[PDB]
């Protein structure tokens, strides 16, 4: 035999319900909400890292060698 799952999440007994303390709206809609909105906006932030700039040049530098057959024969 098995028992049904039990317990008081957040310590709220089955008779009662959870009571808001005052930090919930600011934390969920503000701090967490801003962090999510920041995440999607980060997906559109243009790339500004030194690698992707240097990969482009280094690609050309190795292209003018025996490595990395370039698309155009100039």
């Amino acid at each position: 035999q098995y028992d049904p799952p039990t317990g008081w999440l957040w310590g709220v007994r089955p008779g009662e319900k959870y009571q808001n303390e005052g930090w919930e709206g600011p934390f969920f809609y503000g701090f967490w909400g801003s962090l999510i909105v920041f995440a999607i906006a980060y997906a559109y932030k243009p790339d500004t890292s030194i690698q992707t700039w240097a990969l482009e040049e280094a690609r050309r530098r190795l292209e003018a060698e025996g490595i990395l057959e370039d698309p155009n024969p100039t």
């Binding site: 906006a41 997906a43 559109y44 932030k45 243009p46």
Partner: protein, 78 residues
Amino acid sequence: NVEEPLGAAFYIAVGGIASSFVIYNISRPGPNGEPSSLHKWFSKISDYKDEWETRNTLMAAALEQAAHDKHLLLTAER
């Protein structure tokens, strides 16, 4: 025999994965075309082509000259 709801955590985790799949697909710049309008807007607001170099160079010169004046005043012959 109490029933168990799936619970908000189920939808937060599932919705997070589902939203990530949805957002990532629409974030691509296309096969080979120009980046979408939203990408262009982010570039436009954070343009700063030469804004900071001009402002920074003016500030260093202003504080170079300050230092020369301070040096001339405190090293003045008694």
